[PDB]
Amino acid sequence: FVPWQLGTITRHRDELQKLLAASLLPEHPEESLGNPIMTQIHQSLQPSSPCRVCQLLFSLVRPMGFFEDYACLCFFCLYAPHCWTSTMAAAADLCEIMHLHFPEEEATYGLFGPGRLMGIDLQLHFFVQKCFKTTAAEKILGISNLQFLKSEFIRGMLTGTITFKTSWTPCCQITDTTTAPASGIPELARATFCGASRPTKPSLLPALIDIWSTSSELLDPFFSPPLQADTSQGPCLMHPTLGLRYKNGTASVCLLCECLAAHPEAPKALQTLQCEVMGHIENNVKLVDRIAFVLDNPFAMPYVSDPLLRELIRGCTPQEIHKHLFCDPLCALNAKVVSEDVLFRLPREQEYKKLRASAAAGQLLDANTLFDCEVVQTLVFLFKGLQNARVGKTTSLDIIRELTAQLKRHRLDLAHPSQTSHLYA
Amino acid sequence: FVPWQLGTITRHRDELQKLLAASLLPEHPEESLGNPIMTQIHQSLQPSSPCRVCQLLFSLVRPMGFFEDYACLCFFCLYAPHCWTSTMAAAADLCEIMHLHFPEEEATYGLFGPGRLMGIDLQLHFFVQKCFKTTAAEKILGISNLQFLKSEFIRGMLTGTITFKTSWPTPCCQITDTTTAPASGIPELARATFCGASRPTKPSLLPALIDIWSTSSELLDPFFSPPLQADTSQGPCLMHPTLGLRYKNGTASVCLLCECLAAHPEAPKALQTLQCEVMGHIENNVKLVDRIAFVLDNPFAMPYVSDPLLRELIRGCTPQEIHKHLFCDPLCALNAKVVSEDVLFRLPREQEYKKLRASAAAGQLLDANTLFDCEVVQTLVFLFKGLQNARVGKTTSLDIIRELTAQLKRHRLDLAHPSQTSHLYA
Ligand SMILES: [Zn+2]
Ligand SMILES: [Zn+2]
Ligand SMILES: [Zn+2]
Ligand SMILES: [Zn+2]
Ligand SMILES: [Zn+2]
Ligand SMILES: [Zn+2]
């Protein structure tokens, strides 16, 4: 069983349809007193609510093919960026794990939608809170403080306003002066996915473009949206920012972060683009002009094989590319955690079988070895929260002050977060 | 091809008139819902919009001496003050460079105006942001923070209010790197090319200044005819750093002595000699504005100035304009520190000039102005002019003033205290 397979998405087009419909915003929220979808998402974001996915799983465990297939999904999620595509894929792969190991269970059918799992529940379990990580007991209270803050500011993005200064061991491996520097993905994963030997799994770009052009205007039939649904903002309740807002030629749903999780050569295609932008021009041309100059060229970016991804990146505005490579802290967090090999290279069966054994034995899920820091993660969500919701000016500049300090402690070079918050969505 | 030539201005009177017309303010701005000129300038000042001049250039390369003629223009700007005249000259010399090396492409004609280039675009590219300086890649992010601040406060001067403490942050420049020697002058290649009494000077740009600004403004109390429905009391001020002409205490937001620094070959040394006369001749406690009046009442004043036009202009300025320029305004101080009258106005020796161009086209001479170059001090100067010409909160206004005073002392610039200056002058 392997995650991130476009085929798994098409197989469950029926169930996902229930998930995609349930992840759209109401067309006219002001004309109803409530809405059951928003009520449940809002409930998932209250700090003392149960985790609906953790509760589903415990329901099923009170085989062997199951702890080893589930631990694969967890490992893939741990090495995946935070975005819509990762939630879609984790949704599909959770269907498959449930249809594989539990075909007789009623929880397996009608898995998504109102009263069952929702997009936000996937986000919380696999990406925001990472319930699957193996963590020591003495780290539990500390983690809950940070999870509390994340829930509050994510809920703020849903409802529109916020209700830190009171609330705020080295935090991670980077700030750890003892540790040996990060090699890369752990050894067993490098053995299993790496090497010129490997063909690619199918790209998720077609599904992404279908769903989002059908149910939003992000890009100006797998998914059919209802009316009394907001077809201008897409299935954004599966995205970290919970909405689609436009500013300065950018949008709150970053398309290049979607590419990091939906296409096999996006991680490095962008890393080389960043290198071309910094290195080719040797004078004081500003970053959005450098991007226009690099991508003005008719052959632009030959290092990218798939002409579709090339067509997409060259179609982005210089502001979208500026925001993603140099400004937004969540884009920076997304780029540092992804492993394009784990996500998209077809695994070698001999090495994969030990990986499943090791992960289900609880050995590869303690931390993302490329980047893993709940402190920086939390501030990234706090920042996106002040960017997308009403927040007090004084806490707002408190977050900005601390995020900048941590960005430097962790060797992440961005424009100043206050500039980023002025410029972009 | 040599920049800063009155002749270059004269031949392109056609394109340059179109720039001056597009550089006046609306006559009655409140009676229209918008204005395409103001909308575009305001668009050029947003931090994530492209540089129109950079975009013109890349569109033109996507010859063998274009890169060297453009690099000469850049070198001159680097050693030119920030003012109307320097924007006019860069406009003219950009025309000339386009007719020499790109005469069949349509971009060259209709170079200026709505939908094309504007004064703000020339100012941003050649003077405020200096896109041509050779900068290391690892320093770009930091630079964009400072350019952000500059754009915002210049945009405030355009619209009237501002929309620092959040964004503000090794020596910053050669002045505060106290392990280096104190600056002596322009590079050797430039010294060889421009210096020596043997060298004849190019024509004074003062007539062009005096003509254009008297026909389309009141700054002085036909190259250019202004349209109707335009504010003919403020001149082509959208080519000037303050984006308007306002008056206070016998001064105006357009400083005439800064125009002279860029428009006339002996203004830099004349004013520095005047500064010595003002400081040194009186030996008792007479105020600076009276000392200025005493030096310039004498009928034989400033005999070190040969050109009687420059001499009469300086002597006609009010003691506040001269007080403001020599002792108070921080943008006037930066302008005096950056300018080289030799580069701008002495006829180059062609054998050494060929070496200059090769160096400048190879990027070696555009790393930094060796007389003064500090983007920190540049940014604070634009912040201060912004609080002076636009609505800014009291707490952030007094924050700029205190940081600017600290940097002024750290860079050995002796000015009156900026709070005094902000109270006194435009
Ligand atoms: Zn969970
Ligand atoms: Zn950390
Ligand atoms: Zn992104
Ligand atoms: Zn430029
Ligand atoms: Zn300095
Ligand atoms: Zn001046």
Numbering used by the authors:
A (entry chain E): 2 to 63, 68 to 168, 173 to 177, 189 to 240, 263 to 467
B (entry chain D): 2 to 63, 68 to 168, 173 to 178, 189 to 240, 263 to 467
Any passages from the paper?
We obtained crystals of ORF68 that diffracted X-rays to a maximum resolution of 2.22 Å and used molecular replacement with the initial cryo-EM model to determine the structure of ORF68. The majority of the protein could be built in the X-ray structure, except for two disordered loops (residues 64–67 and241–262), and a region in the central channel (residues 169–172 and 179–188). ORF68 forms a homopentameric ring with a diameter of ~120 Å. Each monomer contains three zinc fingers and several bundles of α-helices connected by loops. The central channel is constricted toward the top of the ring, with a width of ~25 Å, and widens to ~45 Å at the bottom. Residues 435–451 form an α-helix that is anchored by H452, which coordinates a Zn ion at the bottom of the ring. The subunit interface includes ~1200 Å2 of buried surface area, consisting largely of van der Waals contacts and a stacking interaction between F59 of one subunit and F335 of the adjacent subunit. ORF68 contains several motifs with highly conserved cysteines and histidines. These residues form three CCCH-type zinc fingers, as supported by the tetrahedral coordination geometry, a large anomalous scattering signal, and C/H composition of the putative zinc fingers, along with the previous observation that the homolog from HSV-1, UL32, binds zinc. The third zinc finger (consisting of C191, C192, C415, and H452) is generally conserved in the alpha- and gamma-herpesviruses (with the exception of the closely related model murine gammaherpesvirus MHV68), but is missing in the beta-herpesviruses. This third zinc finger is also atypical in that two coordinating residues, C191 and C192, are adjacent to each other. Mutations K435A (top, more constricted side of the central channel), R443A (middle of the central channel), and K174A/R179A/K182A (henceforth referred to as ‘3+’, in the disordered region of the central channel) all resulted in a drastic reduction in binding affinity, with negligible interactions even at 4 μM ORF68.
